[PDB]
Amino acid sequence: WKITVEKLGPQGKRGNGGGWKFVSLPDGSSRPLNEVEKMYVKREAPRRRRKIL
Amino acid sequence: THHRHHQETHSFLEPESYIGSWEAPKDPKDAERMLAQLRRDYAKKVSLYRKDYVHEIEMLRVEKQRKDEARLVAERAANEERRRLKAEAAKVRAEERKIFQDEFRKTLMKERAEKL
Amino acid sequence: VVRLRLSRLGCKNRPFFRVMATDSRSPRDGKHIEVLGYFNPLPGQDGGKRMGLKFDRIKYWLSVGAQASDPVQRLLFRSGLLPPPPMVAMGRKGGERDTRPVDPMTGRFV
RNA sequence: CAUAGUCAAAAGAAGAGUUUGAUUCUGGCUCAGAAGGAACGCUAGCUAUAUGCUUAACACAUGCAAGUCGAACGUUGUUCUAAAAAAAAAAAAAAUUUUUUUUUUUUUAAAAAAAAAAAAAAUUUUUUUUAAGAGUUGAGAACAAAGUGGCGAACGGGUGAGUAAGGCGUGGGAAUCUGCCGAACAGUUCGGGCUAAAUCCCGAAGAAAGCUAGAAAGCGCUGUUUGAUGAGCCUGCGUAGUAUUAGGUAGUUGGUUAGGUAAAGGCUGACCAAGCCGAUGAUGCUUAGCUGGUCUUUUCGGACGAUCAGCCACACCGGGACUGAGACACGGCCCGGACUCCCACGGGGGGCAGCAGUGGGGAAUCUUGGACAAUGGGCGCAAGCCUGAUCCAGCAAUAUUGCGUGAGUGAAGAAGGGCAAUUCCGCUCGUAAAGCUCUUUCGUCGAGUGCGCGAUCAUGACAUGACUCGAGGAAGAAGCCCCGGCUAACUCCGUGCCAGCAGCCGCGGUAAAACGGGGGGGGCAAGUGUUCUUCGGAAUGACUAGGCGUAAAGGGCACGUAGGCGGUUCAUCGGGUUGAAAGUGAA
Numbered sequence: 016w017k018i019t020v021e022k023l024g025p026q027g028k029r030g031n032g033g034g035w036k037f038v039s040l041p042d043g044s045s046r047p048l049n050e051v052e053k054m055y056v057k058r059e060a061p062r063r064r065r066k067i068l
Numbered sequence: 069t070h071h072r073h074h075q076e077t078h079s080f081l082e083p084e085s086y087i088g089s090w091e092a093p094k095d096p097k098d099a100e101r102m103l104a105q106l107r108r109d110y111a112k113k114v115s116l117y118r119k120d121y122v123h124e125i126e127m128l129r130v131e132k133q134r135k136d137e138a139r140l141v142a143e144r145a146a147n148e149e150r151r152r153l154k155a156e157a158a159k160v161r162a163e164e165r166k167i168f169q170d171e172f173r174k175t176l177m178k179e180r181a182e183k184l
Numbered sequence: 185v186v187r188l189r190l191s192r193l194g195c196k197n198r199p200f201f202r203v204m205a206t207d208s209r210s211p212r213d214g215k216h217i218e219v220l221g222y223f224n225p226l227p228g229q230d231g232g233k234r235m236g237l238k239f240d241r242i243k244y245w246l247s248v249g250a251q252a253s254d255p256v257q258r259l260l261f262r263s264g265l266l267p268p269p270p271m272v273a274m275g276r277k278g279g280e281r282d283t284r285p286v287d288p289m290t291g292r293f294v
Numbered sequence: 295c296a297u298a299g300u301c302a303a304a305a306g307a308a309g310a311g312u313u314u315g316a317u318u319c320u321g322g323c324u325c326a327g328a329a330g331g332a333a334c335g336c337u338a339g340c341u342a343u344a345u346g347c348u349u350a351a352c353a354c355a356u357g358c359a360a361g362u363c364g365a366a367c368g369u370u371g372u373u374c375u376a377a378a379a380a381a382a383a384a385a386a387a388a389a390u391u392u393u394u395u396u397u398u399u400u401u402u403a404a405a406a407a408a409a410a411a412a413a414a415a416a417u418u419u420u421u422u423u424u425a426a427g428a429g430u431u432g433a434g435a436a437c438a439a440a441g442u443g444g445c446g447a448a449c450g451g452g453u454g455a456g457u458a459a460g461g462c463g464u465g466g467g468a469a470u471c472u473g474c475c476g477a478a479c480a481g482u483u484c485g486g487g488c489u490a491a492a493u494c495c496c497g498a499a500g501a502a503a504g505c506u507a508g509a510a511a512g513c514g515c516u517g518u519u520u521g522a523u524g525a526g527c528c529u530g531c532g533u534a535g536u537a538u539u540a541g542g543u544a545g546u547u548g549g550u551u552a553g554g555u556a557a558a559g560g561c562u563g564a565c566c567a568a569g570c571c572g573a574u575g576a577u578g579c580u581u582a583g584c585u586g587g588u589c590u591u592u593u594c595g596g597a598c599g600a601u602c603a604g605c606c607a608c609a610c611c612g613g614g615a616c617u618g619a620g621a622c623a624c625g626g627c628c629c630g631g632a633c634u635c636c637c638a639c640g641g642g643g644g645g646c647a648g649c650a651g652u653g654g655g656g657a658a659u660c661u662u663g664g665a666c667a668a669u670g671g672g673c674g675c676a677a678g679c680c681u682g683a684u685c686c687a688g689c690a691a692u693a694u695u696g697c698g699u700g701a702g703u704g705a706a707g708a709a710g711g712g713c714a715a716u717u718c719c720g721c722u723c724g725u726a727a728a729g730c731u732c733u734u735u736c737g738u739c740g741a742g743u744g745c746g747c748g749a750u751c752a753u754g755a756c757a758u759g760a761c762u763c764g765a766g767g768a769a770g771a772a773g774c775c776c777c778g779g780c781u782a783a784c785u786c787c788g789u790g791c792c793a794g795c796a797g798c799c800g801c802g803g804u805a806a807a808a809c810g811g812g813g814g815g816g817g818c819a820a821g822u823g824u825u826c827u828u829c830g831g832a833a834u835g836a837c838u839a840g841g842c843g844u845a846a847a848g849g850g851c852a853c854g855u856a857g858g859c860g861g862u863u864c865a866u867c868g869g870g871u872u873g874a875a876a877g878u879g880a881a
C-alpha cells in the first residue's frame with residue numbers, strides 16, 4: 016500500500032489550513048504529489064466561512 | 069512554516085536496496101546467525117539516528133536562547149530610555165508645582181489672620 | 185519505559201489508531217504523555233492509506249530514547265524516521281493472484 | 295506562483311383551565327415540551343452502533359482469569375550410534391557401497407592399517423555377553439521429571455463501604471528516591487559454605503558475577519557523572535447541610551536536645567513555657583467518593599456523578615511486618631474473630647466488590663461463548679509461551695434525525711357493516727377491497743471467486759459474514775391512545791346518582807357528544823399509552839428578574855461590636871486593575 020504522510024505540527028504547516036504532504040511509496044522511495052493527490056488535498060481542507068446554500 | 073521550505077528542504081529518498089535482499093542459506097543454524105546479525109545491524113543504525121537527532125535539537129535550542137538574549141537587551145535599552153524621559157518630565161512638573169503651592173500658602177495665612 | 189505506541193479509536197469493525205507517547209505501565213486507552221499523530225488502517229478512496237506525524241516531537245522522544253513498538257517501527261520507517269526493521273529484508277510471499285479487473289463504481293467484473 | 299490566498303465558531307425568549315352574580319389584583323394547584331442505567335400494559339419486520347443488578351460492600355457450586363527463562367546453575371533418567379570435503383547416467387534383491395584429497399593415531403624409516411566364549415584363516419574376521427569407577431567413548435535427541443536461581447505477580451481488571459479535608463480541582467516549592475530505556479567514563483581480583491553446582495549466601499581488598507569461540511568482543515553485573523519517566527513530602531487558592539450543636543484541645547501550641555526516616559517535620563523519648571483553634575462558625579450531628587462531564591434551560595441556574603477517561607479509598611471483619619527500586623500487597627505471609635467444608639477426627643482448607651454462572655432481595659437488568667488474527671502488557675538474544683486486558687460473536691424494542699410493510703390502475707360504486715325529514719349512486723366504510731400491469735429494497739433459498747479489507751516478511755476468531763450472480767411472487771411484515779372544554783376529532787344502542795370514568799374543571803337521577811358496545815373519525819407510527827424521577831412553563835426564592843399602608847411580610851424604640859457603605863485638590867508608589875509575551879488549561 017502507499018501512504019500519504021502529513022507533517023503535522025506548527026513547524027510542518029503548508030499554510031493556513033493543514034500540513035505538508037508527501038507519499039513514500041512501498042519500495043522505500045518518496046515523491047511529491049500528483050494532480051489527483053493535489054485535488055484531494057485541496058478538497059479535504061477546512062473552509063473559513065459559514066455554509067452557503 | 070511555509071510551502072517552499074518543505075518543498076526545498078525535504079530529502080525525497082531513493083528506492084531502498086535493503087528490501088527483499090535476503091538469500092536462502094543451506095543450513096538452518098547458519099540462517100539464524102545472519103538473522104541475528106541483521107537484528108544487530110538494526111540497533112546500530114538506531115543509535116546513530118539517536119545521535120543525529122540530539123545534535124539538531126541542541127542546535128535549535130542555542131539559537132532560541134541567543135534570540136531571547138537579543139530581545140532582552142533591546143527591551144532593556146528601550147525601557148531605560150523611557151525611564152529617562154519620564155524622570156525629567158516628572159522633575160519639571162515638580163518644579164512648576166511649587167510656585168502655585170507657595171502662592172496658595174500665603175493667602176491661607178492671610179485669611180486666617182483676618183478671622184483671628 | 186517511554187514508548188511510542190498505537191491506541192484504538194473508531195467503533196466496532198471500524199478501526200482507527202492514534203500514535204501516542206505513553207508510559208509503559210499505562211492502560212491502552214488511558215494516561216499518555218503526549219499525542220503524536222494518527223493512522224488510518226483502512227484503505228481510502230485514492231487506493232492508499234493516510235498518516236500524519238509530529239516530526240519534531242517524535243525526534244525529541246527518539247533522542248531521549250523512547251522504544252517504538254513493532255507496528256510503530258514499520259510506520260516510522262515508511263515515514264523515514266527510523267532504519268528498516270530486520271524482517272522486512274525478506275521479500276514477499278509470491279503466488280498467483282485474482283487479477284480479473286473489476287469496474288470501480290459497480291463492483292462487477294468489467 | 296500555488297500543496298499559496300479566503301478569518302467561520304452557534305442555535306435557543308409562546309401560553310392555557312380553575313376562587314366571583316360579574317371585575318381587577320395577590321396567590322397556589324393542574325396541563326401542553328424535552329429527557330432516563332427505568333418498570334408495566336397492548337402490539338411487533340430488518341440492519342448497524344451504543345447500553346444493560348440503581349436493591350443485599352448479601353452468601354457462593356463449577357471452570358478459567360500470572361506466568362516465563364536450558365543463552366544463570368547442578369542432579370538423575372530415558373533412548374539409539376562406535377575424522378572432514380567432492381563425484382557415481384552404459385554392458386558382457388538393493389541401502390548404502392566404489393573412487394580422490396586433506397587430517398589423527400597404531401603397526402613394522404619408508405610403507406601399511408578392553409575382557410570372555412565358539413568357528414575359520416595366516417594377527418584378523420563372523421556371532422554373543424559384560425563394557426565404560428572407566429590408561430579421556432566419540433556425536434546427536436528431548437531433559438519438565440523434580441528443583442535452585444533471575445525477572446514479573448506493586449501493571450492490567452473490580453467496587454464506591456469509608457472519607458466534609460490527610461481527599462479532589464488548579465497553581466507552585468525544597469528537604470529525597472528512582473528497576474527496565476538513552477548517552478559518557480572504569481572495572482568485573484581471590485578464598486569459603488549450601489549432600490551437587492551457580493549470576494544463591496558469607497568474607498578480603500573498593501563494589502561486583504559470571505556465560506559464550508554452541509551467543510568471543512556478543513550478553514550481564516558493579517562504581518561514578520548525567521538525560522527521560524515515575525514516586526515520597528510540603529503548600530497558596532477554591533470545594534455540603536445544620537446555631538432547637540458555643541466552646542474545643544492536653545502531644546494539645548511552640549522551644550531545646552536525642553532517636554528515627556531516602557527525605558523537612560511532635561514523627562516521638564526527656565526537659566521548659568502556656569499556648570493553639572473559634573461568632574469570617576471550632577467542635578458535635580446528618581449526608582456524601584472528587585473531577586472532565588450527562589439531562590434541562592436565551593445565557594444564569596437546578597438535578598445527577600450511571601457508561602468512558604484522570605485522582606483517591608477498599609479487597610470476609612480487625613491488627614502487623616518480611617521480600618523488594620517500588621506494597622504494609624484483590625487470586626503473597628503471620629495473628630485474632632465470625633461463617634463454611636473435609637477429616638483417618640490429630641487437624642487442616644476458603645474468601646468471585648476479576649469474566650461467565652447460582653441462590654436471596656426486588657417493579658427490574660445478559661452467555662457457565664470463540665480467539666490471541668489486530669492493539670497493549672510480562673518473560674525470552676531469538677524461536678516462542680501466557681493474557682475472561684482486549685477484539686469478536688449470544689440475549690434484551692433499553693436508546694439512536696435509519697429503512698421496509700409495495701408503484702400504477704380499477705365502478706360490476708359488488709357483497710357485507712352503520713346511519714337516515716328516512717333529501718342528491720339516500721349518506722358513509724369506498725378506489726377502499728377483489729381483479730389487471732410493473733419492480734423486488736429488508737428478509738427467504740441456491741451457488742462462485744477470494745494478497746476485497748481489517749496485515750503484513752508471514753500470521754484472519756469474526757466468516758454459515760460481506761461482495762457478485764441466479765430462483766420466485768405483492769409474495770413474509772400495523773398497531774397504540776383519543777373524539778364535553780383545556781385539545782385535532784360525532785352519531786346509534788344498553789344502563790339509569792346504579793354500574794362506572796377522571797390530569798384539572800367535573801359527568802351518570804329514562805332521549806349521556808363525558809359510563810360500556812357498533813360504526814365513523816383524529817394524532818403518532820414499530821411503536822404507542824400508564825407509573826416513577828429531573829428540568830422548563832414557574833418572574834412559583836426574582837444576580838439576570840419580586841416584594842412588606844389596606845392581600846404572606848417593617849423588629850415596640852434606640853445605642854453600639856464585627857461587617858457593609860461613604861466629600862475635595864496636589865504629589866509618590868505599583869497590591870488590585872489593565873496591555874503585550876511565555877508556560878499551563880490531558881484525551
Ligand SMILES: [K+]
Nearest residue numbers: 536539575576
Ligand atoms: K459547623
Ligand SMILES: [K+]
Nearest residue numbers: 463585604605
Ligand atoms: K486532572
Ligand SMILES: [K+]
Nearest residue numbers: 609610611612
Ligand atoms: K482487611
Ligand SMILES: [K+]
Nearest residue numbers: 666668669681
Ligand atoms: K496478542
Ligand SMILES: [K+]
Nearest residue numbers: 334691692821
Ligand atoms: K418499551
Ligand SMILES: [K+]
Nearest residue numbers: 699768769771
Ligand atoms: K403483504
Ligand SMILES: [Mg+2]
Nearest residue numbers: 313314320845
Ligand atoms: Mg373570596
Ligand SMILES: [Mg+2]
Nearest residue numbers: 351352610647
Ligand atoms: Mg461479599
Ligand SMILES: [Mg+2]
Nearest residue numbers: 362443444445
Ligand atoms: Mg520462580
Ligand SMILES: [Mg+2]
Nearest residue numbers: 448449450624
Ligand atoms: Mg493492582
Ligand SMILES: [Mg+2]
Nearest residue numbers: 451452601602
Ligand atoms: Mg466494567
Ligand SMILES: [Mg+2]
Nearest residue numbers: 454583599600
Ligand atoms: Mg465512580
Ligand SMILES: [Mg+2]
Nearest residue numbers: 454455456582
Ligand atoms: Mg457512601
Ligand SMILES: [Mg+2]
Nearest residue numbers: 307591830831
Ligand atoms: Mg426561563
Ligand SMILES: [Mg+2]
Nearest residue numbers: 534584598599
Ligand atoms: Mg456535587
Ligand SMILES: [Mg+2]
Nearest residue numbers: 347348453600
Ligand atoms: Mg455498576
